[PDB]
């Protein structure tokens, strides 16, 4: 799973300023982390539907926060996308 | 229906999580192998629920009895 310093290392990478654990950026990153992990676990275990549900959900949350971000600051959105290597 | 006292009431401060300790766990079984109910074991919902799993572990390890035979019937 994601251990503690893994998650942290992701936050201290995506934080908009020291101490920000909450910004939309850090959320999309953290989500994106959990999502990629999940779909990797779902490459095998094609039969595990219950985790897939969670995935559908995680993903929806991500797309939701993105549509917020791009509604708000296109600059930072675009940057956040380019930095995450997502959508497409 | 299982009326005397509370297996726990007479016992020390004891790990409910130790599968390796028989002599405590033995007291939570019946005349038959059967894991004792709450009426007898007198535990907490969560306590009982632990004692269960630690017993069955103990069993598989070959320490506690899986089943037994009733005497004087």
């Amino acid at each position: 799973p994601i251990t503690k310093e893994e998650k942290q290392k992701v936050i201290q990478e995506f934080a908009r300023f020291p101490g920000d654990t909450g910004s939309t950026e850090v959320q999309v990153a953290l989500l994106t982390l959990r999502i990629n992990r999940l779909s990797e676990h779902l490459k095998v275990h094609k039969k595990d539907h219950h985790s897939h549900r969670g995935l559908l959900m995680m993903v929806g949350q991500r797309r939701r926060l993105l549509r917020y971000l791009q509604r708000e600051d296109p600059e930072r959105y675009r940057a956040l996308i380019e930095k995450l290597g997502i959508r497409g | 229906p299982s009326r005397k006292a509370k297996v726990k009431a007479t016992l020390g401060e004891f790990d409910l999580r130790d599968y390796r300790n028989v002599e405590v766990l033995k007291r939570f079984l019946s005349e038959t192998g059967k894991i004792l109910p709450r009426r007898r074991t007198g535990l907490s919902a969560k306590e009982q629920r632990i004692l269960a799993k630690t017993i069955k572990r103990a069993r598989i390890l070959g320490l506690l009895p899986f089943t037994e035979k009733l005497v004087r019937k």
């Binding site: - | 016992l11 401060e13 004891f14 409910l16 070959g62 009895p65």
Partner: protein, 101 residues
């Protein structure tokens, strides 16, 4: 890595040469799967509940270890290869939980 407890129930009818053999094999397997040992308890011959492999006794060992969880299962498998090893229960260790405290 994570912290486990390996349980070995062995064949009591071993003398020293063969007990040495099984110990060597086990600890060499723990070394090979990357399990750093911490505490080990040898409880030796104990009278079982029900007979395991026709035998009323069993040879008990308890190894607290730490290892690469992704490999734990395989370690178990190797440990079971020997005829003389009658039971292997590896449980993931956890802290004590109490009553009448």
């Amino acid at each position: 890595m994570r912290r486990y407890e390996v349980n070995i129930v062995l064949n009591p009818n071993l003398d020293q040469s063969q007990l040495a053999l099984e110990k060597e094999i086990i600890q060499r397997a723990l070394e090979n799967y990357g399990a750093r040992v911490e505490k080990v308890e040898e409880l030796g011959l104990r009278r079982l509940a029900y007979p395991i492999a026709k035998d009323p006794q069993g040879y008990f060992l308890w190894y607290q270890v730490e290892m690469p969880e992704d490999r734990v299962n395989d370690l178990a498998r190797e440990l079971r290869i020997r005829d003389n090893v009658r039971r292997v229960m590896v449980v993931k260790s956890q802290e004590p939980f109490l009553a009448n405290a």
